[PDB]
Amino acid sequence: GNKTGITYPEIKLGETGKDIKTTITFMNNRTDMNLDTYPGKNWKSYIEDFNKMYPNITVKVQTDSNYADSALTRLQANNDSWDIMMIPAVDKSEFSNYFVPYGETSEMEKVIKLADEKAYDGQTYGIANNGVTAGIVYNKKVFEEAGIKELPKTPEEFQADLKLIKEKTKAVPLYTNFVEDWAMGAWDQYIAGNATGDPKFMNQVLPTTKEPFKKDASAPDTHPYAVYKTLYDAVANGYTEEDYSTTDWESSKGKMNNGEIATMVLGAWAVPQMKQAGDHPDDIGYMPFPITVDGKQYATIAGDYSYGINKNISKEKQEASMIFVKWMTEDSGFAKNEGGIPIKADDESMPETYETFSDVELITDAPAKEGQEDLLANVNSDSELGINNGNGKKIQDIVVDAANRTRTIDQIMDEWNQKWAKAVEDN
Ligand SMILES: OC[C@H]1O[C@@H](O[C@H]2[C@H](O)[C@H](O)[C@H](O[C@H]3[C@H](O)[C@H](O)[C@H](O[C@H]4[C@H](O)[C@H](O)[C@H](O[C@H]5[C@H](O)[C@H](O)[C@H](O)O[C@@H]5CO)O[C@@H]4CO)O[C@@H]3CO)O[C@@H]2CO)[C@@H](O)[C@@H](O)[C@@H]1O
Ligand SMILES: [Zn+2]
Ligand SMILES: [Zn+2]
Ligand SMILES: [Zn+2]
Ligand SMILES: [Zn+2]
Ligand SMILES: [Zn+2]
Ligand SMILES: [Zn+2]
Ligand SMILES: [Zn+2]
Ligand SMILES: [Zn+2]
Ligand SMILES: [Zn+2]
Ligand SMILES: [Zn+2]
Ligand SMILES: [Zn+2]
Ligand SMILES: [Zn+2]
Ligand SMILES: [Zn+2]
Ligand SMILES: [Zn+2]
Numbered sequence: 364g365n366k367t368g369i370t371y372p373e374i375k376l377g378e379t380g381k382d383i384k385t386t387i388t389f390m391n392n393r394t395d396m397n398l399d400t401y402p403g404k405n406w407k408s409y410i411e412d413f414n415k416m417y418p419n420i421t422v423k424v425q426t427d428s429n430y431a432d433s434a435l436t437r438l439q440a441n442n443d444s445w446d447i448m449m450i451p452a453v454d455k456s457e458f459s460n461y462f463v464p465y466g467e468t469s470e471m472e473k474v475i476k477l478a479d480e481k482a483y484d485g486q487t488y489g490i491a492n493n494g495v496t497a498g499i500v501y502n503k504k505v506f507e508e509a510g511i512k513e514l515p516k517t518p519e520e521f522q523a524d525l526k527l528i529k530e531k532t533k534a535v536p537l538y539t540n541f542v543e544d545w546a547m548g549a550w551d552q553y554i555a556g557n558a559t560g561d562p563k564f565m566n567q568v569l570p571t572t573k574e575p576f577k578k579d580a581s582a583p584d585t586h587p588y589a590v591y592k593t594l595y596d597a598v599a600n601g602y603t604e605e606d607y608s609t610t611d612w613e614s615s616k617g618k619m620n621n622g623e624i625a626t627m628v629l630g631a632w633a634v635p636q637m638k639q640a641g642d643h644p645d646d647i648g649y650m651p652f653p654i655t656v657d658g659k660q661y662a663t664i665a666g667d668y669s670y671g672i673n674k675n676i677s678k679e680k681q682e683a684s685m686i687f688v689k690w691m692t693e694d695s696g697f698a699k700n701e702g703g704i705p706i707k708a709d710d711e712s713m714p715e716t717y718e719t720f721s722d723v724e725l726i727t728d729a730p731a732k733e734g735q736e737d738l739l740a741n742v743n744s745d746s747e748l749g750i751n752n753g754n755g756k757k758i759q760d761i762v763v764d765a766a767n768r769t770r771t772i773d774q775i776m777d778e779w780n781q782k783w784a785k786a787v788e789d790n
């Protein structure tokens with residue numbers, strides 16, 4: 364339900380909704396930005412700048428840790444207790460049950476990037492706050508200490524580099540952040556465009572493939588197998604932290620900035636947070652995930668968290684919400700400040716944390732075929748795997764089985780393949 368009769372492309376900032384006085388509530392996952400100590404530009408600061416062209420629109424910001432679970436709970440209460448949230452892991456088909464359509468994708472495609480990401484039946488329901496790549500954060504000082512001269516481009520190269528970090532430095536070669544279910548489920552984001560160079564892989568190939576997690580016999584250093592085995596080998600070889608069950612995310616940022624951690628597998632949004640986390644921001648870099656496909660590396664551009672607007676609020680509140688979202692996207696500088704690509708479609712400016720991406724082919728997952736937009740979500744749900752769905756529990760299990768030598772990676776992938784295989788057949 365779009366109760367405002369105006370779409371995002373039609374909003375002209377400064378002279379749409381200038382009459383409005385209301386209070387909107389913004390839920391998001393950036394707890395760090397909801398504090399005055401935040402090293403960068405925090406939420407209060409963005410809003411103050413917003414209230415300089417919409418001084419009558421008050422923005423209250425709520426943030427929760429374990430945001431993935433808290434936003435999903437609120438969403439299912441299906442009330443008007445929130446105006447904007449970052450969209451949690453809901454099937455693309457339910458969007459209309461909870462969110463205002465910003466406009467039709469073909470029209471949104473003229474004013475924002477990734478317009479078809481949070482889209483269903485031709486309407487865009489979410490706008491990425493930032494465009495991010497799936498890569499690895501790395502401490503250049505730790506890499507230098509170990510004598511690493513070329514960034515690793517293959518899983519074998521990466522393991523050999525981790526070994527050198529373990530042997531020659533005091534750093535954790537790869538810090539798992541096991542305790543954060545979202546940091547573990549982050550590994551699902553690398554198995555498609557990065558592992559295959561195939562934009563159709565995530566939404567077409569993967570849900571029509573019965574055993575997608577098996578080793579690729581032709582290109583064994585590629586495809587989902589190679590990604591999950593990277594994490595498995597790093598742990599089983601003893602190149603991750605002493606005790607995965609004691610990892611702490613906030614202090615991991617400080618440790619990494621101080622050179623106590625060499626690498627963390629996290630999207631490009633993590634680069635600024637690592638930089639700001641101590642002195643030595645210039646020790647923090649970002650590298651493509653170490654998979655090469657036919658002699659070229661690939662990195663998918665996808666949205667960070669996408670702004671969704673509560674279908675249940677009044678017309679004035681939807682208007683104010685959409686204005687704020689458009690301001691965040693077009694005026695705030697949030698994307699640039701948080702290390703990412705602006706979603707505004709009159710701007711590209713590949714942020715600075717990307718020189719090591721000079722020869723990487725950046726890609727965006729293609730949409731499913733017509734009538735198959737649901738297919739990946741159906742297989743996912745039937746398989747109980749939760750690929751790219753915050754089911755970080757299956758990733759934690761990789762860590763636990765590698766560390767306790769309970770199963771091989773091929774046994775793990777085999778189990779997953781059998782759950783997946785039945786789900787694909789069933790759809
Ligand atoms: O399902 C397949 C589907 O994949 C698509 O993929 C998207 C997916 O739908 C989501 O949009 C997802 O969004 C992830 C973001 O890209 C990003 O990685 C995000 O990272 C969060 C992180 O989860 C966590 O909340 C973290 O919180 C921190 C915070 O940053 C700060 O440090 C604070 O101090 O601590 C808190 C922790 O308490 O913040 C990160 C930054 O926002 O995680 C999102 C997932 O939860 O991205 C997927 C991959 O693109 C489409 O491609 C589609 O085609 C396909 O069908
Ligand atoms: Zn005027
Ligand atoms: Zn109005
Ligand atoms: Zn659902
Ligand atoms: Zn449809
Ligand atoms: Zn339909
Ligand atoms: Zn140097
Ligand atoms: Zn090397
Ligand atoms: Zn947990
Ligand atoms: Zn193959
Ligand atoms: Zn190889
Ligand atoms: Zn293949
Ligand atoms: Zn200092
Ligand atoms: Zn330094
Ligand atoms: Zn080849």
Ligand SMILES: [Zn+2]
Pocket residue numbers: 484733734735736
């Ligand atoms: Zn369709």
Ligand SMILES: [Zn+2]
Pocket residue numbers: 778
């Ligand atoms: Zn199992």
